[PDB]
Amino acid sequence: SNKPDHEASSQLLSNILEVLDRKDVGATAVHIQLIMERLLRRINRTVIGMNRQSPHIGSFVACMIALLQQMDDSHYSHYISTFKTRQDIIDFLMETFIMFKDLIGKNVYAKDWMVMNMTQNRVFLRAINQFAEVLTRFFMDQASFELQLWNNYFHLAVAFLTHESLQLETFSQAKRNKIVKKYGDMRKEIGFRIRDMWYNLGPHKIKFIPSMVGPILEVTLTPEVELRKATIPIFFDMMQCEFNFSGNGNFHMFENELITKLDQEVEGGRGDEQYKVLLEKLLLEHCRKHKYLSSSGEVFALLVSSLLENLLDYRTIIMQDE
Numbered sequence: 595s596n597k598p599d600h601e602a603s604s605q606l607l608s609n610i611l612e613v614l615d616r617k618d619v620g621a622t623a624v625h626i627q628l629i630m631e632r633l634l635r636r637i638n639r640t641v642i643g644m645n646r647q648s649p650h651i652g653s654f655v656a657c658m659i660a661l662l663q664q665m666d667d668s669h670y671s672h673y674i675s676t677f678k679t680r681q682d683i684i685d686f687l688m689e690t691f692i693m694f695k696d697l698i699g700k701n702v703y704a705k706d707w708m709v710m711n712m713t714q715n716r717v718f719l720r721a722i723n724q725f726a727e728v729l730t731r732f733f734m735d736q737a738s739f740e741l742q743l744w745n746n747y748f749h750l751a752v753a754f755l756t757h758e759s760l761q762l763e764t765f766s767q768a769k770r771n772k773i774v775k776k777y778g779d780m781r782k783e784i785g786f787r788i789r790d791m792w793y794n795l796g797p798h799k800i801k802f803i804p805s806m807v808g809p810i811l812e813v814t815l816t817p818e819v820e821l822r823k824a825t826i827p828i829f830f831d832m833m834q835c836e837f838n839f840s841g842n843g844n845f846h847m848f849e850n851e852l853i854t855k856l857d858q859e860v861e862g863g864r865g866d867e868q869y870k871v872l873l874e875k876l877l878l879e880h881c882r883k884h885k886y887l888s889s890s891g892e893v894f895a896l897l898v899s900s901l902l903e904n905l906l907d908y909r910t911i912i913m914q915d916e
Contacts (some may be wrong), residue, residue, distance in 0.1 A: 731773070786824065
């Protein structure tokens with residue numbers, strides 16, 4: 595029966611936290627700590643159910659982030675880390691990620707509040723980061739089993755990283771620099787964190803490739819240079835992992851959907867010629883790092899690259915010939 599109170603509650607919920615954020619009124623680290631402790635999963639449940647889009651849900655949105663905006667890692671790690679039986683906290687985390695995907699998908703703003711938009715981007719960065727560290731120190735091969743959940747994470751991570759791109763900052767010549775000075779390039783460390791999570795995964799990667807094949811391309815498809823630069827080697831990485839498998843088998847299964855998706859997005863029109871160029875380059879580098887199977891992957895990547903100029907030429911010609 596909480597329904598009519600939602601907005602009203604948010605009102606309450608608003609002011610408290612913001613007067614908590616009000617600087618010199620009084621020290622509140624433990625106080626906000628407590629409020630966190632006994633309201634987080636709660637409000638998350640709410641906006642799970644409050645998840646209807648038409649109403650004042652957006653307000654709750656701010657509420658949530660504001661909390662965690664104010665609220666510091668020491669707290670995340672404090673007891674929201676330190677819950678009861680682990681499986682419960684696992685459940686909670688799935689709730690978190692699924693909701694985050696539900697946020698980034700169907701964003702609750704008309705894209706004109708891009709300022710607070712950037713802010714909530716940042717706070718989501720921070721929060722999911724804290725989730726990353728706990729998921730390591732509570733769900734790496736130290737928690738060797740029940741390690742699928744990253745599915746969500748990774749897609750969510752990728753799904754996060756799949757907006758606010760070079761053309762977007764292009765809008766004003768100032769726009770890029772503006773958002774960089776205020777924020778930098780979020781995508782950089784976003785992808786880097788996903789990358790180090792990949793590395794941190796360890797041997798269980800082989801359990802995971804065919805799924806994560808899709809995600810690693812958009813990030814690689816990224817218009818920018820540098821993170822894409824650090825991003826390609828992952829490809830040689832899991833192809834090598836598939837080789838650790840290919841001791842029994844190959845990586846043909848891998849390269850198949852590789853090529854597949856590669857197509858549908860390249861024809862979808864994201865990468866550029868220099869994209870394939872640097873692909874070729876770096877993959878070749880990696881192939882110099884390794885022996886014979888690197889040469890095999892080289893000829894396969896030559897096939898790839900070929901297909902790439904085929905597609906780019908296709909695109910440029912279609913947009914101008916019929």
